[PDB]
């Protein structure tokens, strides 16, 4: 039985192959205590990692080891891999093969050090690292589409016609939910609510997850909310206060369609998808417009799935049909595709085994994947 | 002639537009008496405000209306503006434009209520509210630099390259000269001196702003002063006693570079300037590294201006020179910039007029300024 | 006295005819401010064109008005022409005749709108739009050769025997230095350097100009590099080290399958343009191979062509790759030569000819 983990920069989704839902969902945070502990005769370990560090988050200094898809610190990422294998899954890694993921256009050091840590520290028999946007097409079952995966750090646009990826037409954008949480906790200050630390960034993310929707007509929504209307929504802080945010419900996920709010020079996700389509060939575009897959956590607003179809039909040919494939179980779609791809008889000879690893070192990951 | 008021959270600095020094300098406190008054025919009116409420310090309850930049109590800030316009400047505000001030990233209610009070309770013909860290560049004359403001509540970096500011890269830290006073009055206790009340906060601040200096190497200075050396400074209290603060003389403003002393999670002012530079573009960074403008009263220590130059060079690239601009008449630099900016023929079309105000309300400063 | 401007997709090269070097070159860049200007003394001019836009990279959003030879935006091209006349040479266009240029196989709307703008806005007395590859032969002096022009947008071969340019044996390939820079800033992502914006494309181009060289044996170089390392210093004080990705970037010119192109390399389209001619012409077209443009200035571009055309040539045929060191401004040198001729003096297009039949006179007189 093989192991399928989904190392995101937000949550870590892991489990066994052949299932349909990950066994382990917990954020990728490692918290260090910052205060002086005087209750001698207690359990006060020096590093809490996982959802337990979200539970005791008032003391801790929360830190994500992954930023914008690439791993900044390997010390407290080995901690998260150790916690995921042992504490949350209860399996020794020496028997099972592992299936990891990676964003496209990442540095080669991620692949190399990930292979080296998986082989020379956890001693897995086999491993494989896929690309995070092929697995959404694998989970949807199609072999034709343009995958928009976006959650907590990265945003891809990987077109695949019939099992043939076009690597000259992939578009990577670093604008997902982390920057939206930062822009939300920077724009809440205009109303009066001031969230500063990491322990309050974890509260602003929870505000964003259950109160933010994507508008349809942005100017009409900004003209509607200027009148005293029913757009207000009260949220209760974990100490007892209530906060009311009326206007910054759509202004936080409007950075995805206008990236000039956080000062990024790029174009929104509605235009990078269109440019990724127009970088493909003319016979490919006719059924790349029709199959628009979405994935990731940041595509789970009550808006975007019917604002994308407006904004791409605004700049497509008029006789072309666009249908944004947005399944409701798209948050774990990368892991579902990993569990499908790992349970294949055809995939069984694609593994990077332990014998071929030491024959070529950790540089076999650039040629085998 | 225009009026240039600089509402600080601990010092009101007012004057006329076109001068080179503020005419009215007095603290921003309103004193309420807390004792039984037994005389008759006595001049104990109701409440003393300003430098008048520093002579009768032993009887009064000294309340600061502005705290951390935002205004909490609006009734006595109206008293402070009334006192500044009449008893300290002697000018009717119905004949003069008024140039106000505000820290960046403030709540939006402050702009609107300040405009409403200045237009409806003082009847100014025109008004305008600027941002503090822009004005310190008008004072220096240059239009390229990253302005570090500080002093009594707010500490904020605003980078400006060629007259274009980058609001996605401005930072704001609430660690200025009030928390240093409240940390000095708590670190004084372990030697033996117990200053508690609001009348003794003034004595602790008068200790702070004439004895406390910033160390260069903090771990070397805490080992030098641990020996019986020439660092003690006797200070004569207003009743007659002397106090010798040897070691806690550089531990008061080392909070500014290590904010973990008060338990703040943030990094010091040497690292909210480096991050505010690294959020700017690559062409901007080279001559943002070479123009570090200091401002505000908290940056008037015998240390910091050659300690920022040591701490930023530790994390800057090697071939990029740093110049911390310390223009030693910098305490009133945010007023000198206002006197310059109000005395320009280019500026006079930027005034919020009365006829604009009665047709837009106090929501016009959000679209102006 | 005539005017010769070389409106490339990269840098605009202009000056007076009869000279030897252009008066002043500057990139064809119009940038707009994208931040909020909070000042009143300066922070002005609302749009910067040419060299000041390259000076202030950080504020501005730089945007080229020419893509693959064709002119997309006509408003900023008028800004660039007005700047190039007035602020760069200080000459009224009503006095001097102007010599323009154009890549071959362009849409005719380029010639029509270029004529319309050069007459009804600048009041030029005489214009003439030439073709870029004939001017390289005029600069080289010969009438025999095949010109491998390669600038920032286009790359095309025009064979000329002695005059009499064969219009059926001319190729055109959009694989130039802009497509090389967009591949270099995507191949730099592997080592860890992420260049995204236009102001960082302006740094990746500077990296490509002085560290990229054409390898001779590509597989041998790829086996050797596994010390080719060089160090470039980014303009904020940071250094980068790119060993492998400096011969892989101009290798796309000879293997266009890297950036996803069906076409053949420049060593093969040149051979196909030779073989599309007659039988007698090839004996001198092989021996005369002119090159021009800025994309032919890599360290070893001429040697690679000299090596690799002989792999698919007859063995009894000799090939001389004419690579002058002053070939970066060779099209302008040919324009300055060609504009100073009494034979060309009758070949102009006057205002009186334009006043009849509109701007479509360049579809017969060019």
């Amino acid at each position: 039985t093989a192991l399928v983990c989904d190392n995101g920069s937000g949550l870590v989704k892991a489990g066994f192959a052949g299932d349909d839902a990950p066994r382990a969902v917990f954020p990728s945070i490692v918290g260090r205590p910052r205060h002086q502990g005087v209750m001698v005769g207690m359990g006060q370990k020096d590093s809490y990692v996982g959802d337990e560090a979200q539970s005791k988050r008032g003391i801790l200094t929360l830190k994500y080891p992954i930023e914008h898809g690439i791993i900044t610190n390997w010390d407290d990422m080995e901690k998260i891999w150790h916690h995921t294998f042992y504490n949350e899954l209860r399996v020794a890694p020496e028997e099972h093969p592992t299936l990891l993921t990676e964003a496209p256009l990442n540095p080669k050091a991620n692949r190399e050090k990930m292979t080296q840590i998986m082989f020379e520290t956890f001693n897995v028999p086999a491993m494989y690292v896929a690309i995070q946007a092929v697995l959404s097409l694998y989970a949807s079952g199609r072999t034709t589409g343009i995958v928009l995966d976006s959650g907590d750090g990265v945003t891809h646009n990987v077109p695949i016609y019939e099992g043939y990826a076009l690597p000259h037409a992939i578009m990577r954008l670093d604008l997902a939910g982390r920057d939206l949480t930062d822009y939300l906790m920077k724009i809440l200050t205009e109303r009066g609510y001031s969230f500063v630390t990491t322990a309050e960034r974890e509260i602003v993310r929870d505000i964003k997850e259950k109160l933010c929707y994507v508008a349809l007509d942005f100017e009409n929504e900004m003209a509607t909310a200027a009148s005293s209307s029913s757009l207000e929504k009260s949220y209760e802080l974990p100490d007892g206060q209530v906060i009311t945010i009326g206007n910054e419900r759509f202004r936080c996920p409007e950075t995805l369609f206008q990236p000039s709010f956080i000062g990024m020079e790029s174009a929104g996700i509605h235009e990078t998808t269109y440019n990724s389509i127009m970088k493909c060939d003319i016979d490919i575009r006719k059924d790349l417009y029709a199959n628009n897959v979405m994935s990731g956590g940041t595509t789970m607003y009550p808006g975007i799935a019917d604002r994308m179809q407006k904004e791409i039909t605004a700049l497509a040919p008029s006789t072309m049909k666009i249908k944004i494939i947005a399944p409701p179980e798209r948050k774990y779609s990368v892991w579902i595709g990993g569990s499908i791809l790992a349970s294949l008889s055809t995939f069984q000879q694609m593994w990077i085994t332990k014998q071929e690893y030491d024959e070529a070192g950790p540089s076999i990951v650039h040629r085998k994947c | 002639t225009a009026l240039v008021c600089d509402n600080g959270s601990g010092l009101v600095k007012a004057g006329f537009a076109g001068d080179d020094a503020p005419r009215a300098v007095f603290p921003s406190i309103v004193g309420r008496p807390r004792h039984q008054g037994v005389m008759v025919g006595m001049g104990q009116k109701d409440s003393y405000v300003g430098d008048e409420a520093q002579s009768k310090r032993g009887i009064l309850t000294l309340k600061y209306p502005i705290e951390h930049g935002i205004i909490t109590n609006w009734d006595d800030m109206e008293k402070i503006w009334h006192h500044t316009f009449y008893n300290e400047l002697r000018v009717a505000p119905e004949e003069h434009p008024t140039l106000l001030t505000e820290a960046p990233l403030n709540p939006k209610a402050n702009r609107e209520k300040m405009t409403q009070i200045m237009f409806e309770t003082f009847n100014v013909p025109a008004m305008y509210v600027a941002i503090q860290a822009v004005l310190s560049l008008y004072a220096s004359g240059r239009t390229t630099g990253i302005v570090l403001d500080s002093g009594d509540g707010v500490t904020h970096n605003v980078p400006i390259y060629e007259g274009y500011a980058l609001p996605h890269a401005i930072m704001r830290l609430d660690l200025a000269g009030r928390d240093l006073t409240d940390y000095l009055m708590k670190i004084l206790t372990e030697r033996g001196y117990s200053f508690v009340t609001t009348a003794e906060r003034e004595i602790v601040r008068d200790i702070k702003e004439k004895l406390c200096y910033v160390a260069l190497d903090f771990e070397n200075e805490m080992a030098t002063a641990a020996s019986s050396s020439s660092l003690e400074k006797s200070y004569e209290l207003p009743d007659g006693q002397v106090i010798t603060i040897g070691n806690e003389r550089f531990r008061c403003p080392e909070t500014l570079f290590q904010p973990s002393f008060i338990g703040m999670e943030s990094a010091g002012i040497h690292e909210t300037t480096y991050n505010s530079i690294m959020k700017c573009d690559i062409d901007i960074r080279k001559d943002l590294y070479a123009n570090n403008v200091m401002s505000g009263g908290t940056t008037m220590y015998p240390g910091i201006a050659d300690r920022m130059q040591k701490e930023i060079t530790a994390l800057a690239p090697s071939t990029m020179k740093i110049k911390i601009i310390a223009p030693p008449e910098r305490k009133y630099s945010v007023w000198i910039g206002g006197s310059i900016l109000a005395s320009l023929s280019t500026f006079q079309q930027m005034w919020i007029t009365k006829q604009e105000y009665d047709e837009a309300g106090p929501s016009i400063v959000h679209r102006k300024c | 006295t005539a005017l010769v401007c070389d409106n490339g997709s990269g840098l605009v090269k202009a000056g007076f005819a009869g000279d030897d070097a252009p008066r002043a070159v500057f990139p064809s860049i119009v940038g707009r401010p994208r931040h909020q200007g909070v000042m009143v003394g300066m922070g002005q001019k609302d749009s910067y064109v040419g060299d000041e836009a390259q000076s202030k990279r950080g504020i501005l959003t730089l945007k080229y008005p020419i893509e693959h030879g064709i002119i997309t935006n006509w408003d900023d091209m008028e800004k660039i022409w007005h700047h190039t006349f007035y602020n760069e040479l200080r000459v009224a266009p009503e006095e001097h005749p102007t010599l323009l240029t154009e890549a071959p196989l362009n849409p005719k709307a380029n010639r029509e709108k270029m004529t319309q703008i050069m007459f009804e806005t600048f009041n030029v007395p005489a214009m003439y739009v030439a073709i870029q590859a004939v001017l390289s032969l005029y600069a080289s002096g010969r009438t025999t050769g095949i010109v491998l022009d390669s600038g920032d947008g286009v790359t095309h071969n025009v064979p000329i025997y002695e005059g009499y340019a064969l219009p059926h044996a001319i190729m055109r390939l959009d694989l130039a230095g802009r497509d090389l820079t967009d591949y270099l800033m995507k191949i730099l992502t592997e080592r860890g350097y992420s260049f995204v914006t236009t102001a960082e494309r302006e740094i990746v181009r500077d990296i490509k100009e002085k560290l990229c060289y054409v390898a001779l044996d590509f597989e041998n170089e790829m086996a050797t590099a596994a010390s080719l390392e060089k160090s470039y210093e980014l303009p904020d004080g940071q250094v980068i080290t790119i060993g492998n990705e400096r011969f892989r970037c101009p290798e796309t010119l000879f293997q266009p399958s890297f950036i996803g192109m069906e076409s053949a390399g420049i060593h093969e389209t040149t051979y196909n343009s030779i073989m599309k001619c007659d039988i007698d012409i090839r004996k001198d077209l092989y021996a005369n191979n002119v090159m021009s443009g800025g994309t032919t200035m890599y360290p070893g571009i001429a040697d690679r062509m000299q090596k690799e055309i002989t792999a698919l040539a007859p063995s009894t045929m000799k090939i001389k790759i004419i690579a002058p060191p002053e070939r970066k401004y060779s099209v302008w040198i040919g324009g300055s030569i060609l504009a100073s001729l009494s034979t060309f003096q009758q070949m102009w297009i006057t205002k009186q000819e334009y006043d009849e039949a509109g701007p479509s006179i360049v579809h017969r007189k060019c």
Binding site: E67, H68, I70, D174 | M278 | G192, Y193, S194, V196, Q238
Partner: peptide
């Protein structure tokens, strides 16, 4: 920030 060179 997270890369090597820019951002």
């Amino acid at each position: 920030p997270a890369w090597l060179a820019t951002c």
